[PDB]
Design a protein around this ligand. Structure first.
Ligand SMILES: OCCCc1nc2ccc(C(F)(F)F)cc2[nH]1
Ligand SMILES: OCCCc1nc2ccc(C(F)(F)F)cc2[nH]1
Ligand SMILES: OCCCc1nc2ccc(C(F)(F)F)cc2[nH]1
Lengths: 274, 274
């Protein structure tokens, strides 16, 4: 009874109370010889989305070249040629809500038009505030991630909450309804390894803002820093972050390893009484 | 600064503050044609103890036939022929403290004489109270596990704490020092699947007794009940229990999958600030 509403996603509806929601990460695998839409590139995305669906994903998060982990400099024009064909094919062939991982308003707009249901913004409407106008107009959920162009904090948690509020204000001023706001602490962004640990340790503070929280820690550098393990050897590390996140009240986890993290989340949910 | 003493284990000393301690599970693989001590049987145990050492174990827990998971009916005379050669070889070849997983006083005595450092009692000194006299005499740590010959609880957590106190009283009356007492909630013993979940959910209550807590959930039936997965597919499930246990303050985890659980524990420790 924590949430008195469900997350409305067009033809899909996500219950926020019954289980931790698993968002599976789908990064584009660009064909070297085309700008987008080619069979090998799109077929790869579809096959991967189907696998994640079969492994327990509730949302498929689709990211083009300009987003994490690559951060390529690419025009919205180029970005649309690549992202839109993926959204079209995945939305047709995979019966799950799709999030578009972009900070660019025009990309978000075209993605929603192509069939995406949720906007996932690593800059929390601060890089391109018009993304909040797009969100409001289409009445879609938007995930506002904590992020900064600096790591000069006075007090990490207090600053994160203040920064997240600045994002909330941008979204609400644009007309985004409270029920369409989700927050993300931005673990692995604009934070030292030590600061990432401190944010994990204090994640429950985000709950005072009164919005659902999505945690995205999967395979991130700070896990490698602790364990001294490369990106492919971080299942256990990611797992610990997912478990602690759920214990601290997060509603979503954004993960690469859907099969394993879905099992861990299900076990956590059972134990905490979710 | 939670603990103002270290766990003294003869030539070994375990710090209770710096990391979650990993106890690796070693079950005997009985040779069919002998009562104990044979090369294949003991070599198997030694090889396994070395692997667990290399994978991050801090304690090796050695169990003969009459203990979990098999619970064979076997005389102390038979049990000694099997357990003592394992302890002798493992203690010589593997530089870690050894716990003997037995509820039988005479087995515990001979095990300590053979080189074991810690007594691990699934009956918490209630099946054979003389085991507490053995513990006191040799001045070794003893793990008192919650257990009952029934599941008729009036109130699970309150009953567990009362039962654990009855074990503490037996141990202290026998002369066991406070610094040599460790408690275990007995997840998977004398509890319904639902009760096991409830005990996990409320594990932090055990901390009021003021003794270190060891959690032993590895691969247990209740994980299979939640996930509907067989014993070999419970890494993720065990992982969630380990993470939640550490968050709730446990000092030890008793696990089969040392490599994976050691990594998860290290990540948890870093995040909680242990
Ligand atoms: O300290 C808060 C920073 C907010 C912020 N506004 C930005 C605009 C553009 C970009 C860029 F375009 F990605 F470079 C990054 C930004 N970061
Ligand atoms: O309800 C608390 C039960 C305490 C208890 N005393 C026991 C003695 C012997 C055995 C046995 F020998 F293993 F059967 C099991 C026991 N259980
Ligand atoms: O399914 C992947 C192949 C087998 C496998 N390796 C694992 C490592 C760690 C964990 C973890 F402990 F749950 F994180 C689960 C795993 N399962």
């Amino acid at each position: 009874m924590k949430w008195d509403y469900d997350l409305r996603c067009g033809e899909y509806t996500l219950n926020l109370n019954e289980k931790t929601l698993i968002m599976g990460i789908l990064n584009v695998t660009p064909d070297s010889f085309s700008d987008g839409g080619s069979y090998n590139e799109v077929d790869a995305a579809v096959r991967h989305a189907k696998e994640m669906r079969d492994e327990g994903a509730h949302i498929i998060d689709i990211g083009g070249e300009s987003t994490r982990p690559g951060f390529a400099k690419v025009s919205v024009e180029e970005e649309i040629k690549r992202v839109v064909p993926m959204i079209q094919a995945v939305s047709k062939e995979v019966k799950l809500p799709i999030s578009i991982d972009t900070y660019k308003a025009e990309v978000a707009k075209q993605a929603i038009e192509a069939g995406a249901h949720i906007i996932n913004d690593i800059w929390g409407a601060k890089a391109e505030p018009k993304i909040a106008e797009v969100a409001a107009h289409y009445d879609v959920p938007i995930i506002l991630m904590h992020n900064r162009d600096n790591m000069n904090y006075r007090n990490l948690m207090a600053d994160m909450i203040a920064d997240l509020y600045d994002s909330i204000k941008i979204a609400k001023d644009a007309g985004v309804r409270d029920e369409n706001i989700i927050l993300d602490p931005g673990i692995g962004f604009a934070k030292t390894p030590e600061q990432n640990l401190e944010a994990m340790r204090n994640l429950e503070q985000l709950n005072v803002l009164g919005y659902p929280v999505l945690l995205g820690t999967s395979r991130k550098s700070f896990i490698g820093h602790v364990l001294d393990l490369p990106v492919e050897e971080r299942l256990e590390g990611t797992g610990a972050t997912v478990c602690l996140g759920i214990e601290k009240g997060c509603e979503f986890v954004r993960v690469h390893d859907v099969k394993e993290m879905s099992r861990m989340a299900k076990m956590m949910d059972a134990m905490i009484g979710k």
